[PDB]
């Protein structure tokens, strides 16, 4: 008979649920990401001077790498934090999006054709 | 050539020892390729 | 002005609860795995350092009487008490988040109307 | 000493048990029919609960219903997706350099045929420690990217579905734009 | 190069069921500092929790030890001793009280130590600055008085400190701490009359060798930006002329804004930030702490603005999407306005008190 | 064809009813229905439906031949014969050169796009020499 | 030389992701957590429709309803949990 | 150790052998010619020449439609008597003929472009060349104007996995309408095209075509007139690009280097020379961004060969001698036998005030940006 839109009424709840998990996680990231940028620029400059070997030649290659080694040792505990946060966010959004997808699979079925394919005359078809 | 098409081609849970065994296998394979003795590296090479 | 203040107090009270259950979910789900029986004296040390978050999660989900009971019983029978707590707390979290969505549907209208009509202390 | 009195006798709550759950209520602004109280004394006047919480029943209602339309006018996904791209890009600028150093240290560098410890003079016992730490760093930095990319791609899936629905429930008012 | 202290735990404490004081507000501030990309322009530090030997230079050891041992579920043996220390009704006992007190006092002492050693000129501790707590009892939402400890730390190197207070309530704990000394001068701008704490009379200006070295500016209801400016700039200017401070502790309570829960002023974000501007413009070592503030949306926005302006930046007017965004509807802007509340300060009154003050300050 | 929404032609009704109970999984039963919908509105042809159906009815050889006999499939000529072209003269414009496309035109399959091509690439506005 | 380095990099990444994915899959399958989509959808719609009527009636008669209360678990469920933990 | 960075350079030895039609202006043969000079200047010692991995169907339908790619992959010049509906639908048959090896040609082009994108994504290079690519007139649903599969879109998509903003500069004499239509409603790719706007192909590109939706102000058109010279072109080119680099701030550039905008071309109607044309490439390169440089138009093959050779030697960081060394096509380059293309005495139509007007307008539009 006449159809309630149960799926279309759950879709609007899923579409709201999606941003919140990742909202918390995004901010927690931006903190870490912002307390690591100087070290990352250090590492980039160091790798550049070690890999060109001809453009900034002021070093003793044995020490030019001890510096890079120490700097890499400094950045290591931040990568773990980033990995934990990324896995948390991944799981949360995965569940939420499975829900939203299962919904949209149905909201496209109980909607009249003329509302998604237009009237059979508003189609150019030369 | 065509590397990406040759290098590229479970909810049942695991006990503690099966998990440890599988993990040890994967770590050993990683260390195998990091020094150039893998059996998938050598065939393509 | 007081209707707006009540809106703000209500959403604050939702937030503190949701945040507490979140952190406790995190820790407990960390304590649930296959290899947990192996390295237990390390997990048993990350539980003493977080006893307060889990105590508050229990106070919220059970009550101030069963809280001590569950805290002790988990201090002993850890690698099989942790999963049932995790299941309960996740169910509660899901339903409370679902509730907060549908009431935020209404807090917004309250704030619109009274934010307009509340800048008149004459 | 009494800093103040925060709780006035207007927000006091009364609990009523319905079915199996008790619901509190603000009962100072009831109908309390009397001469002194006017309608516009009620803060919660003209807040219709029956039409805020009501279902849709008609697809086009998505664009006029108060609460729902206030929901399809937020752009919180389009902010988050761009934030994800901005986060991935810096990490990748770092990973590319780590990766170049890695192919140099392993030895699979076309432009470096000799032994790597020679081409930047260091003891062959220093090159192994360097290679170990570079390997850890590169692997972790690759994993973070692999996860954050899935986060971002699912945000994009959500955005795609949302726009598709906004365009379906517009019938003949479909001008290409779908910014509500 | 502004030291900015922030401990992540302080936003997880909870005074009581419907209490007006929420430390959570501090967390909201940080959540806008990060999303405003001010994290990179500030030297962000994590305070070293204050020990028990640090906290009993002002307070007594008996009161501090009581604070240490008490606990919300084992206060059946303390319940007699509760109200001997004013704890219990509006200074409740909650879970983790001593941790919160150590966090705030440690932030303040850390800021003072940053300024002592030249590592900065401006320090910020938004989760300290509790000016009501007395030497032997709690008082009006505050248990340990961190500002006295910050000043006792500053006085090791500097020679004369100035404590400015723009919380609508009177700063009675601090004033009573340094009431008989000339090396610290207290200045308060407070609503007077039938109000908490009921001290702060325009004739209370210190004893002993502290005579003339306190300043109470008793205002009245409804005051707004222009009148506040007209009475704030003259007195501050004459204090800097005649006292010659070396360090400035600025207390930035925000219950003096329009719409507060327990406030009776009519300032706005511009009217409030004018005071920070004007005190910063003297180029001094400046600690800048928090205080009151009980409508938390206002507190968050105003304190974010004042931090962005103490660093030197210019934050947008719109608000960046963050976790606590919906607290700020339905406009979502960094602005706090004022209402048509009727002022009660006749110009003659303001000029009379200003002249009495300045004539006191000539000694 | 199968041009009515959900009701006609007892042959098609029985075939649809029996198409489940093997495809009993609904999540991959709605997909088949949507493809039939696309076929009946003239996005596909009888030759382009058969291939996705092979994806669904590979093994159950009884159903597949029923299907082929239901759309009058001919194995003589299997080329797919696409949908005729639209004339953008009678379309809403935005600027000198762009036109808006009929709603149905956005329902042509592009089976390599992930959810980055779908949000970045432009789909609705085409260009027409003014 | 080109293809050699390309293969090495690709294999390195593939094996590392396999390792991480196994770790996560174990942790998540050990995590404890109907009849359709249609059923849960209809359940939620019926429940919302009932709550709306309850709240409109309570609105007219008694007052304006505040946020839903945050309550503990049932007596039965507390019992069963203390049991299985015991 | 890994030393300097060299220029990757994609070439597939079969690409020269595909032949459109009897008197068709487009000759893939020309790429062969370019290579025969890159070999005989001994340039190949400063490049990294790479063979492209031909692209498949599931790689070309990331932009096009299943029906179009299927028709491409199935048609042959003999069995096109059965495809007469598809010819009408897909715009194939007169200007875009069906020939032998059509699909293989398209796969070579698209594979070079995607390979360059992967090279930049990986960090192995900072410049990457592919002269067989750059077919900028192909739509998502059709073929249009000598092009069948728009590989610049595929390169851009592959670039957008790690770079947040991309800039596409187009200096073929025509309007790059496919690459504009693809990214018209988005703010992650900004297109900028300089072209002859008039009674000219394709007919689009009006100065007030600057994007819809979110891509409002993220397309740039510069409509010029006949006979423009090197100094007029430089005057209108350098300001626009300077402000795009200032205000848009990209992270990766795709430079289309068509050469029917040269003096004496078969179809174009401009008046640039080899140095005037190379000025653009050198200016764009001077900004130090990851860059792709693709082919494009060019229908006088001697001029095209010499110019693309010069620009290749100029991206590599070299300086080529102006005498042509003996190569297999020396008799195409008479009678000077020099590495140079010369302008003529045709009359310019772009008065100074016109150029000032459009430059001002465009710079306001770009000031709308962030
Ligand atoms: K004093
Ligand atoms: K004061
Ligand atoms: K052009
Ligand atoms: K664009
Ligand atoms: Zn106060
Ligand atoms: Zn051209």
Residue numbers in the entry:
A (entry chain H): 5 to 130
B (entry chain G): 1 to 9, 19 to 54
C (entry chain B): 548 to 669
D (entry chain F): 49 to 228
E (entry chain D): 7 to 369
F (entry chain A): 503 to 632
G (entry chain E): 394 to 426, 432 to 484
H (entry chain C): 2 to 371
Original authors' sentences:
We sought to purify the endogenous SIN3/HDAC complexes from S. pombe by employing a C-terminal Flag-tag on the Sin3 homolog Pst1, Pst2, or Pst3. Cryo-EM analysis finally yielded a reconstruction of SIN3L at an average resolution of 3.2 Å from the Pst3-Flag yeast strain and a map of the SIN3S at 2.9 Å resolution from the Pst2-Flag yeast strain. In the structure of SIN3L, Pst1, and Pst3 combined with two copies of the histone deacetylase Clr6 (Clr6 and Clr6’), as well as two copies of the WD40 domain-containing protein Prw1 (Prw1 and Prw1’), and also Dep1, Sds3, Rxt2, Png2, and Rxt3 to form an intricate and asymmetric ‘Large’ scaffold. The scaffold, formed by two coiled-coil domains from the Sds3/Dep1 (CC1) and the Rxt2/Png2 (CC2), bridges the Pst1 Lobe and the Pst3 Lobe. In the structure of SIN3L, the segment spanning the PAH3, HID, and HCR of Pst1 or Pst3 is well resolved and reveals a different conformation in the organization of the Pst1 Lobe or the Pst3 Lobe. In addition, the hydrophobic pocket of the Pst3_PAH3 associates with Rxt2_α1, while that of Pst1_PAH3 is occupied by its own N-terminal loop. Whereas the Pst1_HCR is extended to bind to the Prw1, the Pst3_HCR rotates to interact with the Rxt3, together stabilizing the Prw1’. The Pst1 Lobe presents an extended appearance with the active site of Clr6 exposed to the exterior space; however, the Pst3 Lobe is in a compact state with the active site of Clr6’ buried inside and blocked by the Rxt2_NTD. The Rxt2_NTD is unambiguously resolved in the EM density map and stabilized by the following structural features: the α1 and β1–2 of Rxt2 are anchored in the Pst3 Lobe by the Pst3_PAH3 or the Dep1_α3, respectively; the Rxt2_loop1 is further stabilized by the Rxt3. Notably, the Rxt2_loop1 is inserted into the pocket of the active site with the residue Val51 stacked against the residues Phe147, Phe202, and Leu268 of Clr6 (inset). In SIN3L, the CC1 of the scaffold binds to the surface of Clr6, and the CC2 directly connects Clr6 and Clr6’ to form an asymmetric dimer.
